[PDB]
Structures are given as C-alpha cells and as structure tokens.
Amino acid sequence: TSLFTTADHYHTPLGPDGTPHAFFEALRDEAETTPIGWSEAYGGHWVVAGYKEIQAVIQNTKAFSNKGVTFPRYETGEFELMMAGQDDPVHKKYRQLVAKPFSPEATDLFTEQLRQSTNDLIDARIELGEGDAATWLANEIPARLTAILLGLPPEDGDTYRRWVWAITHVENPEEGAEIFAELVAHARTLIAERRTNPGNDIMSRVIMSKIDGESLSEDDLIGFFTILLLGGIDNTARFLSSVFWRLAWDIELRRRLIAHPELIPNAVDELLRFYGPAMVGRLVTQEVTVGDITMKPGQTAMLWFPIASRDRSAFDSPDNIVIERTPNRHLSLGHGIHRCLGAHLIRVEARVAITEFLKRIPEFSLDPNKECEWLMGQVAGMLHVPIIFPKGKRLSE
Numbered sequence: 001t002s003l004f005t006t007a008d009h010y011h012t013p014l015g016p017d018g019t020p021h022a023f024f025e026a027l028r029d030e031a032e033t034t035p036i037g038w039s040e041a042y043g044g045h046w047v048v049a050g051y052k053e054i055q056a057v058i059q060n061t062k063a064f065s066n067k068g069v070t071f072p073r074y075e076t077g078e079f080e081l082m083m084a085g086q087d088d089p090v091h092k093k094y095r096q097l098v099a100k101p102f103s104p105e106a107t108d109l110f111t112e113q114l115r116q117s118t119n120d121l122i123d124a125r126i127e128l129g130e131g132d133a134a135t136w137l138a139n140e141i142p143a144r145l146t147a148i149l150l151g152l153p154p155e156d157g158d159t160y161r162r163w164v165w166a167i168t169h170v171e172n173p174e175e176g177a178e179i180f181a182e183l184v185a186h187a188r189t190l191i192a193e194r195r196t197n198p199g200n201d202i203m204s205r206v207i208m209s210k211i212d213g214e215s216l217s218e219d220d221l222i223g224f225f226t227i228l229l230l231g232g233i234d235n236t237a238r239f240l241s242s243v244f245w246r247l248a249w250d251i252e253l254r255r256r257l258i259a260h261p262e263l264i265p266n267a268v269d270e271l272l273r274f275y276g277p278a279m280v281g282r283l284v285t286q287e288v289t290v291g292d293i294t295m296k297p298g299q300t301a302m303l304w305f306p307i308a309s310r311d312r313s314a315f316d317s318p319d320n321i322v323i324e325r326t327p328n329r330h331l332s333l334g335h336g337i338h339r340c341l342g343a344h345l346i347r348v349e350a351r352v353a354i355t356e357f358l359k360r361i362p363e364f365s366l367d368p369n370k371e372c373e374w375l376m377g378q379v380a381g382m383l384h385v386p387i388i389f390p391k392g393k394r395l396s397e
C-alpha cells in the first residue's frame, strides 16, 4: 500500500491527539523510499514530500509555474493572487512595490502595537477563566494587525474572516463567489477613498505606486488587498492557534519558554517548522524529471512542506520540538523567489503573542468539557482551542 495514492491536503487522517501529525510522520517514513507519489485526488496530481525534491521543484522556475499556487484554486473570481500567483518578470516587479513595508526593520516597528493588542485581547476574558484560544486570541491578533496594514477597521474581523472562508472553504460555488464579490466591493470603496485621502498603510502605498511609468489597475490593487488579507487572517491565525493548542498541553515546552525568554525567537522558528500551516502547488509547464518521476505539462504538483519539514535527512530528531535548534532550514515559509513576504512580520508577531500570553496566563490547559477542532486544507491548523485557566486580572479597565 502507499499513502500517496489518496493523499489530499483537505482530507488528512487525524490521530487521537486531534492533528494529522501521525499521518504526516507515516507519509514521511514512506517518502524515504518514495519521495514523490501520484495521488488519485483532484483528478490526479503529484505529491512532493521529500525535502530535497521540494527544493528541486521550488527552485525550478523553468518547468514550474506559480499559476498553480493554490490547488484546488482559491475562489478569487477573475482576480489573481498578486505575487504568489505570478511568475517573473511580472512577479518581481510587483513584489518590489511592497518590499519596504515588510523589511525586517519596518516589521520590527509593530512590536509594541502587537504587545498592547495581545494584552488587550487577553483582558477580554482573563477574569473568566475560560475561552477558545483560537477565536479569542490567535484569530484576533493577526486580524487586527492585517486590518491596520490594509487601512481597514480593526473591529470587523468577522467580516474579513467571512471573506477568507469564502475564498478558501465555502463548499457551494455560488455562495462562495458571491461572498468574495463582497470583498471586491469593499476593496473598491477603500481604494477610491485612499486615492483621495491616503494614509501610511500598504494599500495607500501601492495605490500611489507606478510600474514602468503607470499606476496599477484597480484589479491589480484588489489582488494585493486579497493576498495580504489571506496571509494574516488565514495563515497566521491557523499557525498561532496550533501553537496555543500545543502550549496548552505540553507543560514541558511551556515551562522552558517561560524560563528562557531569550529562546523564544528560536522556538518560534522551530514551531514554524513543526506547525507550518501551508502547502503550495505548482503548475508543470515543461516535461521535467524530478527524482524518479517525470511530470508533464498541465499536471500539478503539491509541495507538502509539513512532510519535508520532518525529513530525517534534513533535520536531526525531526519529530521533536527542539527549541534550541539552529540552523533551522524549514520550508514552512517557502524558499526561493516566492519565499513568504511576511516572514519577518510573523516571526515578530509570534514572539510577541507567545511572550505575552505566557506572561499573563502561565497556567492553563485544554478544556476537558469542550472539543478542539482542526481545520484541514491548503492552510491547516487548529480552528478551535478551548482552554481553561485560573481567573486573573485585567491590565486595563
């Protein structure tokens, strides 16, 4: 038997712990013999699980195109995910427009805003002794940050989450497209207002930019708005949710982060390796042989980063969360020309979120009376993390 034959990132077998990690470990074991397998899912496609094979594919821009970045394709109507859904030269020219706001030096400037926000969110339920770590904290920290990045109202996370859900998981096609059309309508209004009353946000920045002499089309701007909205509300929320879940039951990892705050950055990278949400696809545009397999134009290859991040040939003791691991060349944020634009930002965000969470609530656990829930898909992570903790006090009010 072979686990590749029915491999499907939206339908990953879950173990008793509630995650797909037992399955990931088993597939990792099989990938030592067969690093790339054909899955019958989605009409048939390639599943690339070995670390060196993923590197070979992701570095080859000649035979692989990012037009297949989301598979099944995300619901974004007639729009494309800017940067992520493009190949060079188009990709490079668009990314250069937002490189500055995402530089490590620029992203460092969000630290205090994120520290205060995390604390403000925690105040909301600290006196209650219970709450869903995902919905209450993990979803909100990035939702608020992203809204600020886009010049949107921070208090409308449910609206943004509804759009994101439509793009990534709504099952009914029409309902999905109609809800994404809502995002487009809101974006149009935002763009027109920024057009005349600009601010210091990134949308404002791209609206005033120019490529080869001319301003970007409204459609291009909607693509920028969409991909940045997805990075925060989807990717970051699912990652942090899985992290909070882990910290709720792993009392060993938790006490060490509290005792060694200086290890938190390295710990964040190790958690990124272990709980990376993502996976990405690539559209084959040229017959190419990777490893022992030959791919043909028109086929799609899914890069299963979570399996590659557990490759024994790339990481010693891959199944353990070694907080002091360094270097840590995980693929959770991609590699090459499409490597995560938000890499430094999410490292800062995770450091702050974890630090403040453990500072305010050093003692907590999973709620024995409530169920945790894992969200499967191209971005996979905990969706519901009910926890309980001894009642505490608010910092403000």
Ligand code: HEM
Pocket: 066, 069, 082, 083, 084, 085, 091, 095, 227, 228, 229, 230, 231, 232, 235, 236, 239, 276, 277, 278, 279, 280, 281, 331, 332, 333, 334, 335, 337, 338, 339, 340, 341, 342, 343, 345, 346
């Ligand atoms: C923990 C959070 C996140 C994870 C795990 C994640 C992961 C990834 C990965 C795997 C890629 C590579 C795409 C490919 O190879 O095709 C990527 C690309 C990208 N990400 Fe992130 N991401 C996260 C958060 C964010 C955030 C917060 C933003 C920005 C606000 C963002 C913006 C982007 C953009 C624009 C690209 C495309 C870059 C390009 O094509 O050059 N991501 N991300």
Ligand SMILES: CC1(C)O[C@]2(C)CC[C@H]1CC2
Pocket: 069, 070, 081, 084, 227, 230, 231, 235, 278, 279, 280, 378, 379
């Ligand atoms: C899943 C992943 C990695 O995240 C986003 C934000 C960029 C590329 C793809 C699709 C959307």
